[PDB]
Amino acid sequence: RTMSENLRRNLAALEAKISEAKTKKNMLQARAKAAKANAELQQTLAAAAAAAAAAA
Amino acid sequence: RTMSENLRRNLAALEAKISEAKTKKNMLQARAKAAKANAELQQTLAAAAAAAAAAA
Numbered sequence: 001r002t003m004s005e006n007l008r009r010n011l012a013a014l015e016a017k018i019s020e021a022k023t024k025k026n027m028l029q030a031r032a033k034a035a036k037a038n039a040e041l042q043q044t045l046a047a048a049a050a051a052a053a054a055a056a
Numbered sequence: 057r058t059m060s061e062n063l064r065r066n067l068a069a070l071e072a073k074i075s076e077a078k079t080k081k082n083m084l085q086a087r088a089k090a091a092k093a094n095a096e097l098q099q100t101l102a103a104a105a106a107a108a109a110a111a112a
Contacts, residue, residue: 038059049070053077 045070049074053073
């Protein structure tokens with residue numbers, strides 16, 4: 001019964017760090033999607049506008 | 057939120073130089089139309105009047 005207290009805390013501590021990893025996963029996946037869009041939009045707009053305007 | 061201030065200024069600065077280019081476009085197109093008419097009128101009138109008058 002002293003081992004089952006230890007196991008019940010270890011089981012709760014394991015799911016607590018699995019739970020933490022899952023929230024971190026979503027925030028990291030979001031930043032990567034946002035950063036991919038920021039780079040494409042900024043570079044595409046700046047390059048296309050400047051090149052077309054100068055040539056014309 | 058510091059990136060969205062930067063993007064909101066860059067978006068306003070882009071449309072400001074597109075706006076400037078559009079006003080310049082109209083003034084340049086006008087001068088080219090005027091210059092084409094000035095040349096044709098001056099040369100046509102001077103040449104036709106002098107040649108016909110001298111021959112007659």
